[PDB]
Amino acid sequence: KERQQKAEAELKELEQKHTQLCEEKNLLQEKLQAETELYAEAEEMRVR
Amino acid sequence: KERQQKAEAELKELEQKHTQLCEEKNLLQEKLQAETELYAEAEEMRVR
Numbered sequence: 001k002e003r004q005q006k007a008e009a010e011l012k013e014l015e016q017k018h019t020q021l022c023e024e025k026n027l028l029q030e031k032l033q034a035e036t037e038l039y040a041e042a043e044e045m046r047v048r
Numbered sequence: 049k050e051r052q053q054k055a056e057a058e059l060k061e062l063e064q065k066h067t068q069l070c071e072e073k074n075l076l077q078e079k080l081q082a083e084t085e086l087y088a089e090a091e092e093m094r095v096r
Contacts, residue, residue, distance in 0.1 A: 007051050010058045017065045024072045035079045038086055045090050 003051050007055050007058070010055055010062075014058055014061060017062060017069075020069060021065055024069050027076065028072050031076055031079055034083065038083055042086055042090065045094065
């Protein structure tokens with residue numbers, strides 16, 4: 001039972017880093033969008 | 049045996065998730081540095 005308790009604790013750690021994965025995916029979408037927007041604005045400003 | 053191999057699979061998942069988190073953080077820092085430098089140069093040339 002202590003062995004399955006350790007396994008369940010690792011499972012809670014898995015859930016916590018699953019939430020971390022979701023946060024990091026949202027962060028990745030946001031940062032990629034920001035980079036693309038700034039690159040487009042950069043193209044327009046170098047045309048200017 | 050089943051519990052320990054399941055725990056090892058969970059540990060591999062933990063390592064993969066943490067590696068993905070670290071890689072996305074590195075992408076974050078490099079592209080944010082790029083964003084800051086682009087903003088600075090854009091404002092400089094814009095006022096010019």
